[PDB]
Design an enzyme around this catalytic site. Structure first.
Site, short mmCIF file in Angstrom:
data_model
loop_
_atom_site.label_atom_id
_atom_site.label_comp_id
_atom_site.label_asym_id
_atom_site.label_seq_id
_atom_site.Cartn_x
_atom_site.Cartn_y
_atom_site.Cartn_z
N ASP A 35 -7.35 -46.28 -38.21
CA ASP A 35 -6.00 -46.18 -37.68
C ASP A 35 -5.64 -44.74 -37.30
O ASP A 35 -5.30 -43.94 -38.18
CB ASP A 35 -5.01 -46.72 -38.73
N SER A 199 1.45 -39.12 -20.83
CA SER A 199 0.88 -39.76 -19.66
C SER A 199 1.65 -39.32 -18.42
O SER A 199 2.83 -39.05 -18.48
CB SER A 199 0.94 -41.28 -19.82
#
Length: 330
Positions: A35, A199
């Site tokens: 994770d 992004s």
């Protein structure tokens, strides 16, 4: 040194991925959920409340000659999906794919929430976010990656998750055969303890690319792709009959649909998520309503590039002094 381990979806939907991890001496092999959105290595154990264990493999420290109680240490974690676990701590030898760390904090669960109990395939979590998020008290502990880092040939690990198929986590090296084209690297902020990046925008299907900054985290421990409501609405508007359902808990769409792809920007590069990756199947057995793999982050407080996004790429988690993230197509 290096390590290389195969990671395998737990079910037909890729709800999560498990990777075998050797703990203790002799080795006890547990299948852990790696994770990149948390920083605790915790396991089902001989100390876990018996009623809360249902099929998991447990770590038994008393059978490991290298286990040592970390005296006074406790841990307690709550995840974004509302699940939780807590317990005490041992140090022991932990190996992943041939890479060995001695003195790793292995957090032994005394209690786990129902979500964990109900998933017989996940024996615990191995956190790969930054150690500043580790929950051990009163002495915070380091992640497996942080402990291994100095010994690694290069201070990196990579995630290469499969779509409905096994993939690979590598430590200490970049497998140049595992991706196509070049890797594009992008800046990371560690201020919140995550692999947080920005992004450069998105496209829906064959649509034009929208240049827009989207801050979010690269999180292998989250199944879906969580993005701003504007972006998500623009995606689902291209699927006839799709709608957000408060009763189901997100966007659903007719199972008869052909889903469009979704592209996200990494610098000037583009990662394309095929439409099929966004299908999470019937909301309930036999339903013709299917659950979407792109969902709104509104009310989470952060955008999350979960498995839906990451499995479309070869992803480099660069833990150099100034960390960065790299993405390549594959």
């Amino acid at each position: 040194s290096t390590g290389s381990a195969t990671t395998t979806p737990i079910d037909s939907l890729d709800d999560a991925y498990i990777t075998p991890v050797q703990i203790g001496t002799p080795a006890q092999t547990l299948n852990l959920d790696f994770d990149t959105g948390s920083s605790d290595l915790w396991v089902f154990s001989s100390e876990t409340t018996a009623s809360e264990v249902d099929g998991q493999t447990i770590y038994t420290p008393s059978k490991s000659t290298t286990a040592k109680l970390l005296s006074g240490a406790t841990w307690s974690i709550s995840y974004g999906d509302g699940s939780s676990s807590s317990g005490d701590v041992y140090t022991d030898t932990v190996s992943v794919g041939g890479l060995t760390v001695t003195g790793q904090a292995v957090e032994s669960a005394k209690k786990v929430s129902s979500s964990f109990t109900e998933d017989s395939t996940i024996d615990g979590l191995l956190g790969l976010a930054f150690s500043t998020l580790n929950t051990v008290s009163p002495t915070q502990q380091k992640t497996f990656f942080d402990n291994a880092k100095a010994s690694l040939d290069s201070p990196v690990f990579t995630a290469d998750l499969g779509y409905h198929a096994p993939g690979t986590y590598n430590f200490g090296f970049i497998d140049t055969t595992a991706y196509t084209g070049s890797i594009t690297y992008t800046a990371v902020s560690t201020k919140q303890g995550f692999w947080e990046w920005t992004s450069t925008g998105y496209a829906v299907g064959s649509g034009t690319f929208k240049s827009t900054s989207i801050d979010g985290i690269a999180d292998t421990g989250t199944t879906l792709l969580y993005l701003p409501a504007t972006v998500v609405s623009a995606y689902w508007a291209q699927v006839s009959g799709a709608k957000s359902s408060s009763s189901v808990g997100g966007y659903v769409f007719p199972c008869s649909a052909t889903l469009p792809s979704f592209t996200f920007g990494v610098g000037s590069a583009r990662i394309v998520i095929p439409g099929d990756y966004i299908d999470f199947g019937p909301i309930s057995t036999g339903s013709s309503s299917c659950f979407g793999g792109i969902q709104s982050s509104a009310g989470i407080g952060i955008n999350i590039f979960g498995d839906v996004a990451l499995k479309a790429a070869f992803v480099v988690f660069n833990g150099a002094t100034t960390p960065t993230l790299g993405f390549a197509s594959k």
